[PDB]
Design a protein that fits this description.
The complex is a heterotetramer of chains A (about 120), B (about 350), C (about 450) and D (about 100). Chain B folds into 2 domains: about 90 residues, Immunoglobulin-like (Sandwich); about 240 residues, Rossmann fold (3-Layer(aba) Sandwich). Chain B has 9 helices and 15 strands. Chain C has a single domain, classed as 7 Propeller (Methylamine Dehydrogenase, Chain H). Chain D is built from no helices and 9 strands. In chain D, the strands form 2 sheets. Chain D has a 5-stranded antiparallel β-sheet with strand order 5-4-3-8-9, with no helix packed on it. Chain D has a 4-stranded antiparallel β-sheet with strand order 1-2-7-6, with no helix packed on it. In chain D, strand 3 and strand 4 form a beta hairpin. In chain D, about 35% of the residues are buried. The chains are: A mainly beta (about 120), B alpha/beta (about 350), C mainly beta (about 450), D mainly beta (about 100). Chains A and B meet through loops of A and helix 1 and helix 4 of B. Bound molecules: a molecule of 5 linked components (NAG-NAG-BMA-MAN-MAN) and 2-acetamido-2-deoxy-beta-D-glucopyranose (4 copies). The site of a molecule of 5 linked components (NAG-NAG-BMA-MAN-MAN) has 7 residues of chain C, from strand 22. Chain C: This is Integrin alpha-V.
Chain lengths: ~120, ~350, ~450, ~100
């Protein structure tokens, strides 16, 4: 099946950036889009954005707007997310979620990556 | 003329005593590199979801190709299923939810016609309009195609068509369409009036007035200078292919199996559209007969409404117009099918 | 030519009720009064909890001629269980089919929905009500155990009805079997007798019906229009049916046997999307003692003298010959978008000249598109192609077109003077006008 | 923004019982709701798509029903592995949203 494998754990002082990876594998049919979701410790899941692999088309969350950017690599099928202007309230575990077109449910998730912030 | 850049002349005044024939030639000179307004009108059924997938490639592959043929390129978007009364759709509530949950796709209520995106040169607004778009459906197989084609035609300040542009209307479906008198199964018996009825970008006579006839549809496509391309996927390409003689100025293209030729379908049909120049006369005065003869740049002499194919720019297609009179007792307009400029003939 | 224009009988109905969507004559057996029947399928009845159920009225033939509604039904929606309706009668269009033979008034509600016996649904299956004198029964043959678009669930039967002379009745339901449509024919003695009002799907013994077909025949609307007339000399009215979307939307018209529902003959349109099958009639227009087929196609576009396609309408006029083949000539409309051939009304021998006549209407013709009716006379060779008289509706539109001539009915003389008379329904202004033929 | 309110916040039951988990919506999502299971230390795992369809490979005690606004998730026999935090997910419009979860 589709295995989404991310980058390692991170730690970064406030006012910095972080670039997490999510290498799609298994069965890639180019009609999928990689999402990212935030799970703060002891809080619910939080939608960050969307990146469709055919166009490079992006869809973002308005709470995160102006701070999140999603780019990609076509040949290695690795899609990137870059949060900028990090705060201490951004400390969470980040998952990468794979759709297919038209059905915006999260079929595949992969492991997580742990971002820590302060000092 | 001194105004029209394509059809010359633009205004000729002819005085006739009956039993006498008048005669003039009217040259049609096509332009190179028109501005192009392309409005997609997509069937929102569940079978069409691979086709709405392939609408992602419009801003990348199609707009690069159309720069070599046009000077502008503005995209719009619309959506139709069918009229939202029984027996067309299911008016039972949990039959809808079973029917949505079967398709493992995001669904929305079925609708007559929703205008989504006006004509704009931002391809990132076209990609917003595609990924926002969901699935609907009716119960019977035909769709409300021709009913939405007239609302995408007559509503000029809502679709946002330009006068100075080549107006294309890509109709995109895989089934056939209901006709004007299918509506009697729903008790819809008041005829389609032919005016614009978008209240809030939703067609709000979709349950009261009926489907248009092919004569009602074709008179509104020609008065609004709108060129219709049918992009039909399944076996019902041959249905729309056989209605093309009844609908003058319409091109029909077959979407292949994997929809690999959607961007080729708009390119090839726009090539066939400026290659064909034919005319028709609107005659609203009595006792006057027109007789128009087409002289092709090949030299082959065709009837006036047959027109000349393989026309490029720097060709001047000539229409030898002959007008007679039978009895005494206003003006007539002779215009090419698919052009913005006409020719006004006073009597 | 002999119809009276200067003083016809103007009948009126409730506002917005579609008074005149269907018209017929009611002449009882042993009453010696004569009545006009009129359907108002969107008229508010006094039925409990039912909005615009639709009603069939009975208009008298008198000087102070008023129209009284017939109580075919006075009940509300029956229930399957507690707080779960079995059926749905609001907006059911009762009165879209009004048809009468001498004691019997068959009136049908096409848009009737019902919750089926196996699950909860709202399926437009249609019912009909048969008033044979003082006993009213319910006739619902599509309301059965085959329940889907796949089966008879979206049948919408009673969309078109007609009486056979041998006391059968022909039902046309245009939505059965994924809109293949279906004819259903059954004896009137089977309907009145086998009626338990607490049984929901009634089985009939002498019922003749067409069956499923292959999927290429889907969306054809068989039973969109019906007619009766004899076509193989067995003395029994054979069943004629207009099938407007068959054969890739050219339109067909089927003729079935009246005795066992087997296919006798077919017709086929020549232009796609012209509704070949919107109206069928059958009368002996030339007097050869063979019934002649009259097929309207209101959305037919002909080439003008310039080459333009003008949507004028067309009526296929076919004369029956004894060898089995027919002689088809074609009659075109006059004004564009006026829908010539939407209603084919056999008049009988209107002029009393020995040849039957037909009124053909264009419900959106004339000055301000009010509606015209064209009177065509018979001759020994067939039909006279030039009309004899035009009938201009004098009612201006209010909120929809007046639709003069959308329903007509003739071949019944009310004055008992010898020349048959014509009622014309004009439901956009909720009228139903009666014309009286003059002595020649 | 379609706010998905889910009740109860926590739900203390016994192994082998039956559990029901409600989920309301801000507006009509017509079976556009999906259900997820998240054990501690793991990613969320989709259980039911489009409010009633079963993901293959999942034991069929997890069955949902509901439409429009109010949807439910019903566990037949509450197995000891079923105790996790369960989420709703609206797929009707952008932004995609979740419910806050229900511990078990
Ligand atoms: C007037 O026009 C109508 C409209 O086309 C014609 O009607 C069609 O006629 C054909 C045959 O001429 C019919 O096809 C036949 O169907 C029979 C039964 O249907 C089967 O399939 C359905 C659904 O798939 C099942 O539910 C059903 O139970 C049956 O299994 C078949 O038995 C026939 O097959 C045999 O036909 C002949 C027999 O002589 C053999 O030569 C064949 O090889 C084969 O063994 C056939 O398939 C079709 O159904 C009709 N359509 C409709 C709508 O009725 C009329 O024929 C035409 N009449 C005239 C006078 O021109
Ligand atoms: C027609 O279009 C051309 C270019 O497409 C433009 O220059 C011209 O002004 C237009 N004419 C009218 C009458 O809109
Ligand atoms: C135009 O028509 C007239 C009349 O038939 C004819 O004499 C003349 O040659 C025609 N012009 C051309 C260019 O053929
Ligand atoms: C019937 O009554 C309903 C509700 O009172 C109303 O909406 C409808 O317009 C009425 N119809 C007619 C024909 O008066
Ligand atoms: C119907 O009757 C006709 C009479 O000629 C006969 O030929 C035909 O076989 C009959 N069909 C059936 C199914 O009995």
């Amino acid at each position: 099946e589709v295995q989404l494998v991310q980058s390692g754990a991170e730690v970064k002082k406030p006012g910095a950036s972080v670039k997490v990876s999510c290498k799609a594998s298994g069965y890639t049919f180019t009609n999928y889009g990689i999402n990212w979701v935030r799970q703060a410790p002891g809080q619910g899941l939080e939608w960050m954005g969307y990146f469709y692999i055919g166009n490079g088309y992006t869809e973002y969350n308005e709470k995160f707007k102006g701070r999140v950017t999603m780019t990609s690599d076509t040949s290695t099928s690795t899609v990137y997310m870059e949060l900028s202007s990090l705060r201490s309230e951004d400390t969470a575990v980040y998952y990468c979620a794979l759709n297919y077109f038209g059905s915006r449910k999260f079929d595949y998730w992969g492991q997580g990556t742990t971002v820590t912030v302060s000092s | 003329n001194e105004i029209n850049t394509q059809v010359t002349p633009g205004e000729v005044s002819i005085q006739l005593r009956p039993g006498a024939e008048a005669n003039f030639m009217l040259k049609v000179h096509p332009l190179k590199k028109y501005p192009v307004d392309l409005y997609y009108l997509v069937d929102v059924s569940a079978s069409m979801h691979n086709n709405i997938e392939k609408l992602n490639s419009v801003g990348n592959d199609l707009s690069r190709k159309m720069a070599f043929f046009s000077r502008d390129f503005r995209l719009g978007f619309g959506s139709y299923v069918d009229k939202t009364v029984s027996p067309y759709i299911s008016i039972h509530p949990e039959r809808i939810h079973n029917q949505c949950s079967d398709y493992n796709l995001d669904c929305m209520p079925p609708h007559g016609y929703i205008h989504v995106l006006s004509l704009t040169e931002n391809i990132t607004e076209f990609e917003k309009a595609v990924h926002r778009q969901k699935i609907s459906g009716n119960i019977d197989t035909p769709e409300g195609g021709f009913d939405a084609m007239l609302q995408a035609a007559v509503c000029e300040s809502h679709i946002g068509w330009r006068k100075e542009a080549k107006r294309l209307l890509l109709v995109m479906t895989d089934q056939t369409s209901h006709l004007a008198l299918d509506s009697k199964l729903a008790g819809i018996v008041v005829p389609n009036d032919g005016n614009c009825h978008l209240k809030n970008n939703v067609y709000v006579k979709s349950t009261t007035m009926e489907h248009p006839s092919l004569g009602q549809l074709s008179e509104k496509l020609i008065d609004n200078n709108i060129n219709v391309i049918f992009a039909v996927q399944g076996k019902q390409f041959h249905w729309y292919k056989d209605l093309l003689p009844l609908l003058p100025g319409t091109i029909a293209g077959e979407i292949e199996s994997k929809a690999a030729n959607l961007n080729n379908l708009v390119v090839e049909a726009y090539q066939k559209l400026i290659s064909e120049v034919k005319v028709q006369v609107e005659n609203q005065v009595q006792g006057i007969y027109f007789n128009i003869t087409a002289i092709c740049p090949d030299g082959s002499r065709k009837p006036g409404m047959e027109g000349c194919r393989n026309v490029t720019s720097n060709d001047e297609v000539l229409f030898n117009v002959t007008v007679t009179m039978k009895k005494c007792d206003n003006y007539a307009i002779i215009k090419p099918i698919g052009f913005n400029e006409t020719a006004k003939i006073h009597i | 030519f002999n119809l009276d224009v200067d003083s016809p009988a103007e009948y009126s109905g409730p506002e917005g009720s579609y008074f005149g969507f269907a018209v017929d004559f009611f002449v009882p057996s042993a009453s010696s009064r004569m009545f006009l029947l009129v359907g108002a399928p969107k008229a508010n009845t006094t039925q409990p909890g039912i909005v615009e159920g639709g009603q069939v009225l009975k208009c008298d033939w008198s000087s102070t001629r008023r129209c009284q509604p017939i109580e075919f039904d006075a009940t509300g929606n029956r229930d399957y269980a507690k707080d779960d309706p079995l059926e749905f009668k609001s907006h059911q269009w009762f009165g879209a089919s009004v048809r009468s033979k001498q004691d019997k008034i068959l009136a049908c509600a096409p848009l009737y929905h019902w919750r089926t016996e196996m699950k909860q649904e709202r399926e437009p299956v249609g019912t009909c009500f048969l008033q044979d004198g003082t006993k009213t029964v319910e006739y619902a043959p599509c309301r059965s155990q085959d329940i889907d678009a796949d089966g008879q669930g979206f049948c919408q039967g009673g969309f078109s009805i007609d009486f056979t002379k041998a006391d059968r009745v022909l039902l046309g339901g245009p939505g059965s079997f994924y809109w293949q449509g279906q004819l259903i024919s059954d004896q009137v003695a089977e309907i009145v007798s086998k009626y338990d009002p607490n049984v929901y799907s009634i089985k009939y013994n002498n019922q003749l019906a067409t069956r499923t077909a292959q999927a290429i025949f889907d969306d054809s609307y068989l039973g969109y229009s019906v007619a009766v007339g004899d076509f193989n000399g067995d003395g029994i009215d054979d069943f004629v049916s207009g099938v407007p979307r068959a054969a890739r939307t050219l339109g067909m018209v089927y003729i079935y046997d009246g005795k066992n529902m087997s296919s006798l003959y077919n017709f086929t349109g020549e232009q796609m999307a012209a509704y070949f099958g919107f109206s069928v009639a059958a009368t002996d227009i030339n007097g050869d003692d063979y019934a002649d087929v009259f097929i309207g196609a209101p959305l037919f576009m002909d080439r003008g003298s310039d080459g333009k396609l003008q949507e004028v309408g067309q009526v296929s006029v076919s004369l029956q010959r004894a060898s089995g083949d027919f002689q088809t000539t074609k009659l075109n409309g006059f004004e564009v978008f006026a829908r010539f051939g939407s209603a084919i009304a056999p008049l009988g021998d209107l002029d009393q000249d020995g040849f039957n006549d037909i009124a053909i209407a264009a419900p959106y013709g004339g000055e301000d598109k009010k509606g015209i009716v064209y009177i065509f006379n018979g001759r020994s060779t067939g039909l006279n192609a030039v009309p004899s008289q035009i009938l201009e509706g004098q009612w201006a539109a209010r909120s929809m077109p007046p639709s003069f001539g959308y329903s007509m009915k003739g071949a019944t003389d009310i004055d008992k003077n010898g020349w048959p008379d014509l009622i014309v329904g004009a439901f956009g202004v909720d009228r139903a006008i009666l014309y009286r033929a003059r002595p020649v | 923004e379609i706010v998905l309110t889910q009740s109860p916040a926590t739900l203390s039951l016994s192994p082998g019982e039956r559990a029901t988990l409600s989920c309301r919506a801000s507006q009509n999502i017509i079976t556009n709701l999906h259900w997820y299971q998240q054990k501690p230390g793991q990613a969320p795992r989709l259980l039911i798509k489009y409010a009633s369809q079963s993901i293959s490979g999942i034991p069929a005690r997890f069955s949902g029903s509901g439409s429009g606004t109010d949807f439910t998730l019903t566990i037949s026999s509450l197995e000891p592995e079923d105790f996790a935090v369960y989420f709703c997910q609206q797929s009707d419009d952008w932004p995609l949203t979740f419910g806050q979860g229900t511990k078990l």
